[PDB]
């Protein structure tokens, strides 16, 4: 309304909704497997 | 005057504002 006093009005919400689930692309730790075929990526990259 | 009497005038409109004008 037109305005010492509180503001009037009534704005009811509607609820919650998930918008996007994100994955944190931070480099993980390295685990040692002696087999010669496993390799680990040092940085921002993916195998095709 | 007394509630329930007889008068020649209609009562004023019953307004109830939510905020002070």
């Amino acid at each position: 309304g037109a305005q010492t006093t509180l503001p009037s009005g009534l704005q009811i919400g509607t609820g919650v909704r998930p918008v996007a689930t994100e994955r944190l692309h931070s480099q993980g730790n390295l685990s040692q497997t002696n087999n010669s075929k496993d390799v680990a990526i040092k940085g921002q990259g993916f195998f095709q | 005057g007394v509630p329930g009497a007889l008068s020649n005038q209609p009562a004023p409109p019953n307004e109830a504002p939510i905020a002070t004008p």
Binding site: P7, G9, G13, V16, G43 | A11, N14, I18
Partner: protein, 249 residues
């Protein structure tokens, strides 16, 4: 006969408050959420002769603006603001808006968007060098590091537009983005200037400020008030039922 309406109104508006409270509790985990405060205001009916009827109506005097507990997520794009600070984001209708959700995402082409709203800096929306380790300083300075190149670069890109505005001067819009009130717009201009005294922390996300004690007490009070109004309605209805026999000669 109309006393069955007065109480009814209270009961109805009680439900309204409950809705608001639910709308708060559904957003207990929403980042940068500002819980809406609810308040019943009494309106008396003006007219002859004996002013006995006074109804209620619920209202939401803005939001609760006490900053919530911070969440330490190790993401450099996540920001938490000093108390009474706002990020400026372009809203849906090409206009400015203020938000506290500091979860900034990088688009495929390098646009900084919060919840799909492109963030606005000192020069407008920000264009980040496609693919870059963004680091935000304590006052909003953005440094971009391009992969592969050396680290003596970390060249700065821009600075966020951080706005100081207290809770009295700001009203929520229907999209959930806060804006200035008409009085505050008249007294402080249309678009607010960036205040360099606002400190912004990178790597922390601010949660909601929904107090559960207040919500529980509000629910208990609402339930009791609803039961009282239902009892009053029953009494009035029974009285009128007994009174409607006089007409029998």
């Amino acid at each position: 006969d109309h006393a069955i309406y007065t109480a009814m109104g209270a009961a109805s508006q009680t439900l309204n408050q409950q809705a608001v409270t639910a709308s708060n509790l559904a957003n207990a985990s929403t980042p940068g959420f500002r819980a809406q405060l609810n308040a019943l205001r009494a309106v008396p009916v003006d007219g002859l002769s004996l002013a006995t009827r006074t109804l209620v109506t619920a209202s939401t005097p803005g939001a609760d603006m006490t900053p919530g507990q911070l969440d330490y997520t190790s993401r450099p794009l996540d920001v938490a603001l000093q108390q009474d600070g706002w990020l400026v984001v372009q809203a849906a209708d090409g206009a400015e808006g203020y938000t506290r959700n500091g979860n900034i995402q990088v688009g495929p082409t390098g646009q900084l968007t919060i919840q799909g709203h492109p963030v606005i800096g000192e020069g407008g929306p920000i264009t980040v060098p496609e693919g870059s380790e963004i680091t935000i300083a304590a006052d909003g300075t953005i440094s971009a590091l391009n992969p592969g190149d050396p680290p003596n670069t970390v060249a700065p890109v821009g600075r966020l537009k951080l706005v100081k505005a207290e809770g009295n001067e700001v009203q929520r819009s229907d999209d959930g983005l806060f804006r200035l009130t008409a009085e505050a717009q008249a007294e402080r201009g249309a678009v607010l200037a960036a205040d360099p005294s606002i400190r912004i922390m990178s790597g922390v996300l601010e949660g909601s400020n929904v107090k559960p004690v207040e919500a529980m007490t509000d629910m208990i009070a609402n339930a009791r008030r609803f039961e009282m109004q239902m009892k009053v309605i029953t009494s009035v209805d029974e009285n009128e039922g007994r009174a409607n026999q006089l007409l029998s000669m």
